[PDB]
Amino acid sequence: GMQRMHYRNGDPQTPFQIAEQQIQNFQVANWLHFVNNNQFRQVVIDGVLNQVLNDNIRNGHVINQLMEALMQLSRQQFPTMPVDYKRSIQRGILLLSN
Amino acid sequence: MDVLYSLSKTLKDARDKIVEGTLYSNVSDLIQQFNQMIITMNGNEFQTGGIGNLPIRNWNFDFGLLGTTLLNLDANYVETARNTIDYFVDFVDNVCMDEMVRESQRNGIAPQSDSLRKLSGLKFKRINFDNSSEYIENWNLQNRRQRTGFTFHKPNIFPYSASFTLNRSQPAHDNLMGTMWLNAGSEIQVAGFDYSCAINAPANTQQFEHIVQLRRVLTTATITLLPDAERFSFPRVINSADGATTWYFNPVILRPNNVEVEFLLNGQIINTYQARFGTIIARNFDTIRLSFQLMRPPNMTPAVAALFPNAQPFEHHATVGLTLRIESAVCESVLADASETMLANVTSVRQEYAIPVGPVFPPGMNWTDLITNYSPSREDNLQRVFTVASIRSMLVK
Amino acid sequence: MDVLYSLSKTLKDARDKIVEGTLYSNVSDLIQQFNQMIITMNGNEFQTGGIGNLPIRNWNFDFGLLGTTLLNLDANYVETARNTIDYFVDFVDNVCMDEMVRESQRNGIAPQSDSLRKLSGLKFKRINFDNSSEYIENWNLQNRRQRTGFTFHKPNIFPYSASFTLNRSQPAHDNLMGTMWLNAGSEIQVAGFDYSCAINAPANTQQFEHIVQLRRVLTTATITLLPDAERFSFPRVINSADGATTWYFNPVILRPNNVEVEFLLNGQIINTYQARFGTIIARNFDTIRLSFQLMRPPNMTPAVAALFPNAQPFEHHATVGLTLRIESAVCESVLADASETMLANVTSVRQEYAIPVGPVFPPGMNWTDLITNYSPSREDNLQRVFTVASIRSMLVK
Amino acid sequence: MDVLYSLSKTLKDARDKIVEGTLYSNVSDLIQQFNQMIITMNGNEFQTGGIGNLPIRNWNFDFGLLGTTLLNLDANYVETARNTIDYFVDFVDNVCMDEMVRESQRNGIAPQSDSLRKLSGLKFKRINFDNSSEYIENWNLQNRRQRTGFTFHKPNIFPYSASFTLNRSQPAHDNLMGTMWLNAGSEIQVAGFDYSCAINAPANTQQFEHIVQLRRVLTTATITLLPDAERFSFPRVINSADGATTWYFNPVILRPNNVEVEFLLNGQIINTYQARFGTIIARNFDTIRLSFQLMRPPNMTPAVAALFPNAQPFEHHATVGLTLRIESAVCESVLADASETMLANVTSVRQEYAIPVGPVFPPGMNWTDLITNYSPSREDNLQRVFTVASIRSMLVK
Amino acid sequence: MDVLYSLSKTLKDARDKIVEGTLYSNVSDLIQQFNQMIITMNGNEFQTGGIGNLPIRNWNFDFGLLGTTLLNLDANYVETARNTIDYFVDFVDNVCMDEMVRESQRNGIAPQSDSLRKLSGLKFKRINFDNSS
Amino acid sequence: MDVLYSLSKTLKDARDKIVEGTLYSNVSDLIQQFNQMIITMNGNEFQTGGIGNLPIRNWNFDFGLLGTTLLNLDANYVETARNTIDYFVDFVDNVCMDEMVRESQRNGIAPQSDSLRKLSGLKFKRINFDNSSEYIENWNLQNRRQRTGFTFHKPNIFPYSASFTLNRSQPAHDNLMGTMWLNAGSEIQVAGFDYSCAINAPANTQQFEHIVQLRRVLTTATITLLPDAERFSFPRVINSADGATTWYFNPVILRPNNVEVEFLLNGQIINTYQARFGTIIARNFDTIRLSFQLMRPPNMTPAVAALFPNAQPFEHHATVGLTLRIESAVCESVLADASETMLANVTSVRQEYAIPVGPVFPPGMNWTDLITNYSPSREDNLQRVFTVASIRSMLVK
Ligand SMILES: [Zn+2]
């Protein structure tokens, strides 16, 4: 139901983000910053020199990002256009959930 | 202007109906209205300030709507909302205040600030709603050109005036006759005194009269009229009319005789009451005339006779008086009264921000000065300014 | 009756929530209600007025409905509406006024006019809505039968009464003892005087008492009680009880001793306060009893001793007093107070249209006369008439 | 707590919008909200009362829903509803009253009754709605911490205080100099007297001063300031400071000279007015300081000269005074005033049910005692208790 | 006894590390410990008071668990939690106080109250934690 | 605000738990939290200073993140981190200091600086954590509202007061009776003296009393009470009450008789101790009342008898006294005490940067002046300012 103005990108900065400043549903909102980040935390110097860009212990096994990626999905079930739509859409989403 | 109004009942009927609990269906007709706003706004730049002790804060917009459709409002929904309202609150404040200090003789009954001049714009008109706030209700009916109307308990129609008029006097001020009074707010107290106790007066009766001309007509007034003027019932040492010396007033009170109160409108008697004390109704008037007499007592016990000799010195001064209080009334023009905070709000914001004296209002928004010379310009500016104060008080007290 | 109400909140919540701008979903629940009305009406002919200097106008209907399409309200929509409301406004006025004059006696609590007798009809009941106007809220609860109630500021419960009672007097009126008072509106001032300063009184104390019986019970009253009666603290020349002569009162004030205020209900003490000045609560009472004493000072400086000799002449008259003001209270019966315009509205409409004195109300709707003999018939008529005045003030002030 | 609120606007906006006639649509958004409640309830048991003369009643819930089925409400629909509301009415009453008596120091603010401690429970929050009742509007904002605010008329900020201070006195009390005053409610009257009429004073002027410290800050105050203190303008016999004897006060009034009123906040002058009588605004203050002088008249007619000799005895006592009344103001803390019934409601319920004195409030909810030592605990309890009284008055007056 | 201790550092290190907007990582090791408790409790009923001017408030248990899902704590998460802690707070108070009066000469060093004598029970020991007080 | 807190325990639990060698695992839960921050930051800009001798530094961000799956941290890891922390350190300092001087009245309880007003922003709340620092623990609970509280050693509740009261005196000051005291910090010393040694007193006993009213309630106070006031046990030459001359005090000490200490709360005795010296507990009080007597010794050896003659001159002045010290206590309001550096930190930062006197705090943050008039505004500002000082001391001492 948000911006029914679908969007309008020319070429600003990080077209995926920007959504955070204007989205009202925290769950949705964390995804955005986390995804618009996790820059592949390019900083590693191991076992005697080894620039091997690592990534979130978070991602690692703390996994939750997943749990949050889902919880945010668990509250996207609403109106706007024809019915053959939400029906098909959310049903798919659930298959991710289970 | 009308724009402005909405912006508030929007927030109040908002920061009020939107709390952890209630079903969506309790605000469906509401949520909508809200969003509509956000849209119209987003993108347009603003500025407020530039005068005395008033900061110059800029406001940029870029906000999303409220699609989160969940049967019951979960706490999380609120907070993500309150955070968006608290920018509009802290905003409007800075908006009201900005147009609550600027004045204009070439006509002030209109937008002045770079903030509001942009609000009356057409593209913003897409917002108005629920105008049940006594003041806006009256703003509209006026800008359409028609009979207005307001409510006041102990209205403030009489500019402060405390004086006397000596109808008979002499250098020694030992045998005076005249009246003294206090007109202030919604009250009038007037006393008629005759040092000679009408000893040489026709029918041993001295006539008195006190006329008060209102600067605006009052309608549907509930009034208390009582005999005696307590304020002028005690011994006083007063300055002479020319300020050169002081006279002594030593009153002894008698009942006012043949009391007649007339409430006139354009010279015509609309209501007249003869010796009726207690509660009386004056339905439409711009003038009050109080007539009363001092009648020398035809029969006196020794103690009384002793106060009123046939010859001077006159040491006990016969005094009769009246007290009149307008408890409530309706006026077509805004006025200060004993219950509304409008005058105090406007005066307070101007004082706090060290707003310089302007071309319309008297220094300090002085009520007596304002009502004494209540010009059309002062009234239009006062109404604009009072209506804004009332819009502000819906959110900020 | 209830019918009438709607007709208004209909228009107010209308002439208010319907302006150039707002979205449709702000009034969907409203528009509907409205139309419903129009239907029920069109076709039925009405008539109003006829008594006194009150015109007699006829009304006919066949007005169109309202588009329930457009998303945003375009100016053009308003005007084609306001023009249809301004017939209902100018109508209702002529309706209220018509039933705001007739009076009955028994079953005088009901409708009277050829205008309203047709409204209570059944086919019209299809209109009631949002009964949140303090007065209707109370009309209903009464019709069924329940514990009503209204809120008043400086209520008007005491019929004007200003007099005295000499408990000890003699022809010369040079050694009196008694009380004098002023009961008016929400205030009582009473003074007890003893010219002899209790010189020969037991324990050198003179007891005083003032009882005031309310015509209606007041509940939840916030009251200010202060020592001294300023109104009776100055020199006066007063008419004797028989009107044959005049006496001299030259008060000197002492603190009232053993002050006891009792608020009684049906003879029972509900609240009692001993020498407590300031703000006190009287929760339910139909009578106020003020008891206070003058106690001759046991120790006196020379200046004081000189005022109170062992033998006449008594030239300084010892006086003690009390002042009691009911700031606010609740009453199960309608009353005039210092804030509401009901009495003034009813009185004003009757005066403006030269309405002849009827069989129920005193000439001029005189408050003192009304409250002095507040019969059931006067109260039922007053309530009907006050409720109508309140319905009218929602649209016309 | 917030819970409680809803329970009412639920019923009012109910017992008001639900009657024989109305079209469904004006209540669709309403009906819903309602039902939601019923559900949450049914099953749960409550304990109301158990203290003093307070009936202990049990309450079970097992009620139906509503017929969204019909179009235009038929009489039969109402009655089957009113019968279900009258259990909630008679309930809430017994609920308010129960938590309108308990008090506690440590955690005085929070709920106390076995009735309410269960309401703040989580499973209930599903009820809140339309929080536009001035008081709740303020309760919330306080639990969040912000510039709250209430509106009053003739507020009750001054604990009763009536006394004097003799700056110059002697055993005979024949040549005194000092001040006497009455601070009560929203009013202050103060007089400065000098028996010698400043005969030996520098510049023949005697300075006076009266300072009053408010227990809470008042903002946006509209104030009436008038010269003279009528209360201290008449002859009095007063007790000496040590209570051992009585002195005589025989005033003669002169205009107060060099009047200066300062409204201070934390020692700083926020507003200052020099000899300005009438209506003045004090925008934020916790202290009022009134300074005024008695200046011996430089020129006197014989009658005046005779009152003021060069040597004792001084028989006419020169007096100057001021009267100040706070008509309206805003306070961040709840207070009693001349219009609201809160204090009276709380005090009345406690008195009617013979509620024992507790650990927080003074006996009888005495206002003077309460405001004199207005501790944080008393204020939190007062606010809780006032908010409940206001919730109750929406249904029961 | 040691039991008692935990019940607190549980709440403090709780009412403290759980705020309107933080990361799960700060509490994974914490959340867990917490829940464990709830379980052991629910089903058991308690009594406290019975002396001088000490009220006798009775307690039951039947509370949900904790969203082990999220990353950042959304406000809504807090409130639904604080409401469950405020029963333990107002509880423990009434618990401490009860065993903070009954004295005993003989075996005085040990537990006394009908509240605590049941805590030293074995089925509860399943809770001790961070004893740095 | 709460924001601010985190920023620190972040760094401390950082600059502490991150050293050359530590196994990774014990920081995993930590590293994470950290990074999260960096993100939220980088991009937004900040303004610091602008008042007095307070530098005006600017700040920007864009710092790489931190590794994850390592094991044991190599030196190289540290340095590349410490260099990134030292920008936050030198930052926060400049941040605390900036909001540690600004003061507002209307709402001086909340954020002020252009630095912090931006922190309370929503997009920031993404950080709050580990709130175990006694002060924040209390900040929150106050926000939500409830039984807050802090811990103090030799607290600072008594504004400095050193004076005397002569109950019996004469020009020569050769036979005085009264008390002298010193109230300061957490201690009270008071002595009662009677030059006549109760020679003509009833029962040869002179009663004394000393009352001290705290500006805030103290609970759970551990107090030392000892007989004698050493401070008033030596010879003194003191200024007379009017400052016109000096008197001689030559004490000889006797044991205080019938010692009674009462710790009252709102006029009620909460704790009372009769002649109990040593350690006593006062659990909740806002007032301390010390009553003690001087009883003339009924039996005296010659040496003693010689000090107390039946007639003047009285050369040895009988004195009895008490000493009371509050070792520890809890207060719901912040206060200075003998262990915490908060007051000193705030006062020191303001002094070092030549911060101008503001509208809330007394010049120099003077403790006596502050506690003497401990208004709500001063307390809210003090708490804000003390909480910030405590956040700062976690990193900078
Ligand atoms: Zn009034």
From Swiss-Prot, chain E:
It is found in: Virion. One of its GO terms (cellular component) is viral envelope. Residues 62-73 are annotated as: Interaction with the inner capsid protein VP2. The N-terminus is blocked. Sumoylated with SUMO1 and SUMO2. Sumoylation of viral proteins seems to have a positive role on viral replication. Keywords: Calcium, Capsid protein, Intermediate capsid protein, Metal-binding, Ubl conjugation, Virion, Zinc. One of its GO terms (molecular function) is structural molecule activity. One of its GO terms (biological process) is fusion of virus membrane with host plasma membrane. Homotrimer. Interacts with the inner capsid protein VP2. Interacts with the outer capsid glycoprotein VP7. Interacts with the outer capsid protein VP5*. Intermediate capsid protein that self assembles to form an icosahedral capsid with a T=13 symmetry, which consists of 230 trimers of VP6, with channels at each of its five-fold vertices. This capsid constitutes the middle concentric layer of the viral mature particle. The innermost VP2 capsid and the intermediate VP6 capsid remain intact following cell entry to protect the dsRNA from degradation and to prevent unfavorable antiviral responses in the host cell during all the replication cycle of the virus. The VP6 trimer contains a zinc ion located at the center of the molecule. The zinc ion is not essential for either trimerization or transcription activity of the DLP. Zinc-depleted VP6 has an increased sensitivity to proteases. Belongs to the rotavirus VP6 family. This is Intermediate capsid protein VP6. The chain holds residues 1 to 133 of 397 of the full protein.
